[PDB]
């Protein structure tokens with residue numbers, strides 16, 4: 351038994367790892383490369399898709415599912431297991447990827463073909479292929495998120511996928527992994543832990559209080575898959591002490607996802623499940639409004655506050671949020687609140703730099719609006735949490751993250767007495 355990395359090796363995008371054991375060949379995740387590496391999506395998988403017996407999916411994010419349609423595109427026709435949640439979320443996610451995609455590497459034909467082979471698999475359910483036994487573990491990174499426990503040949507392998515940030519309240523706690531012979535783990539935040547959730551929420555409400563009372567606009571760039579609605583959960587549960595203001599979820603995508611949430615109750619925390627039981631939907635705070643078209647979205651640019659606005663892209667790589675910033679950043683009474691990680695060398699980091707003005711949609715705009723960075727809202731397990739999850743495991747191979755982060759995590763693991771290595775593309779590791 352051995353696992354072969356085929357993405358997310360000394361990098362963060364591209365998750366896909368071939369499991370070779372018991373004459374069977376299981377594909378663990380199959381995501382697209384993003385950012386600067388985006389062209390690699392056109393390159394070859396590094397293995398014959400046609401020779402895959404089955405593929406498992408940890409969660410619906412593009413960086414872990416994005417290259418599945420390409421897998422079918424080239425022949426593969428086996429089953430693709432995932433949680434109901436991961437399945438339903440994937441449809442929304444992929445149809446959007448198709449639509450919002452400059453240079454395609456797969457077609458609509460490849461999409462339904464892929465969606466068509468998806469087969470449900472829930473936490474604690476065991477799959478069997480030859481002597482190989484597979485099952486999903488609770489990851490708490492998204493609804494339906496999970497880590498893979500592969501067991502066979504007298505060995506045991508644990509694949510982490512993306513471990514969530516246990517401190518938040520929407521998803522349930524990640525599960526400790528079973529003691530394994532080998533753990534293929536992520537390290538997005540191998541260098542540092544996040545600011546505590548609790549105090550992050552507090553600082554969050556603080557910002558809203560001040561901004562909303564002076565009739566300002568609270569701008570919140572956000573991803574449409576889970577971050578957008580988690581922010582709406584906070585609003586929903588602290589909305590009793592917040593000044594009245596319309597809440598605009600300026601992202602059709604984010605809405606579709608929201609609509610789907612009620613159908614996913616089981617996948618959330620006991621707290622979130624308790625609300626749904628009282629007949630209420632904690633993802634819909636008062637005055638919530640989902641903006642469908644550009645016309646209304648642009649009117650919000652020139653609409654006096656107070657108002658809370660949410661829009662993507664979450665990395666500010668484009669989207670309606672730019673238009674909101676282009677017209678809301680020069681008023682000191684408004685507040686920009688980053689709730690997601692901002693890549694370096696981007697407008698995000700650039701804005702946090704705090705120059706006198708910034709370029710947006712071809713126009714240097716004075717930066718007076720106050721800026722904030724609430725990292726406590728990260729959906730990834732921080733370094734302290736990483737060390738916890740990984741505790742006790744004899745051997746660990748690192749994926750997902752930048753060399754440095756992974757090395758930082760590595761060093762700590764090593765000094766702890768654990769064996770470790772950063773995965774390499776192609777170079778398999780013995781389970």
Ligand SMILES: [Zn+2]
Pocket residue numbers: 409411413491512
């Ligand atoms: Zn993810």
